[PDB]
Amino acid sequence: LVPRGSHMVGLIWAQATSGVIGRGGDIPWRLPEDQAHFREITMGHTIVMGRRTWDSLPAKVRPLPGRRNVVLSRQADFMASGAEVVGSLEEALTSPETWVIGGGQVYALALPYATRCEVTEVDIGLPREAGDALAPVLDETWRGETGEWRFSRSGLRYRLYSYHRS
Ligand SMILES: NC(=O)c1ccc[n+]([C@@H]2O[C@H](COP(=O)([O-])OP(=O)(O)OC[C@H]3O[C@@H](n4cnc5c(N)ncnc54)[C@H](OP(=O)(O)O)[C@@H]3O)[C@@H](O)[C@H]2O)c1
Ligand SMILES: CCc1nc(N)nc(N)c1OCCCCOc1cccc(CCCC(=O)O)c1
């Protein structure tokens, strides 16, 4: 679908209903169905993440296998074994298809150039708190489809949105 000379930029995240995506340096729920969904969308593509999101990756999947891991940092000496570190967004989006995988800061940074969002909404009532990382706000150019609610094996309810724009 994507012409190979172009640069499709997508954002992928899971959020509570409130928009909270991160808290205390972690994701404040566990949803294996969404872990699998995240792998399914991102596999075989370049993935771009902020340094704090790299830090938060489970050690057994750091770097995330099967994907070119790109970490944004202002720390020139940052050690990200098995990934590459860039100091600006410009050098991070040179691939034909790129998925931005977090966190709050880097979603906001990449949002102007994104034409796809894959959003998991978790039906968990976490009100916004000081310090939370938050999902980006999507303007009126976005459109998309809302999936049906499903229960995870644990009983946590979630649904998938697929957004796109020109
Ligand atoms: N629910 C989800 O889908 C999801 C996904 C990913 C992450 N998370 C969670 O989100 C939280 C992390 O998000 P966050 O907003 O705090 O941090 P982040 O976006 O993951 O990383 C921020 C770091 O990225 C670097 N950075 C940001 N802008 C930059 C720029 N213009 N140029 C160069 N470097 C830049 C800086 O690294 P340096 O400080 O090293 O300079 C900055 O500290 C965690 O809680 C994580 O668990 C949730
Ligand atoms: C899985 C959490 C998550 N979900 C969605 N839909 N989008 C995201 N961007 C996202 O964050 C992923 C990066 C930070 C957390 O990283 C992980 C947390 C738990 C498991 C995994 C491995 C998943 C399987 C794989 O991708 O190989 C990453």
Resolution of the PDB structure in angstroms: 1.6
Residue among 30, 63, 70, 26 nearest 47 (CA): 70
Whether 14 has a binding-site annotation, put simply, is yes
Is 104 marked as binding a ligand?
Answer: yes
Measuring from each residue's beta carbon to the nearest atom of ligand 1, which residues come in under 6 Å?
A: 13-14, 21-23, 25-27, 50-53, 56, 72-75, 78, 87-89, 101-106, 109, 133
Assign 110 to helix, strand or coil: helix
Burial (CB count <10 Å: 0-12, 13-18, 19+), residue 78? middle
Tell me how far the alpha carbon of residue 55 lies from the centroid of ligand 1, in angstroms: 9
**Ligand 2 centroid, distance to 20 Cα (angstroms):** 15
Task: In whole angstroms, give the CA distance from residue 137 to residue 19.
Answer: 9
- Domain count for the chain: 1
Task: Name the experimental technique.
Answer: X-ray
Rg (CA), the chain: 15
Which residues form the domain of 79?
1-166
Q: Which long-range contacts (CB under 8 A, 24 or more apart) does 68-74 make?
A: 68/95, 70/46, 72/48, 72/106, 72/109
Q: How buried is residue 145: exposed, middle or buried, by Cβ count under 10 Å (0-12/13-18/19+)?
A: exposed
Residue with tokens 């939370």: 132
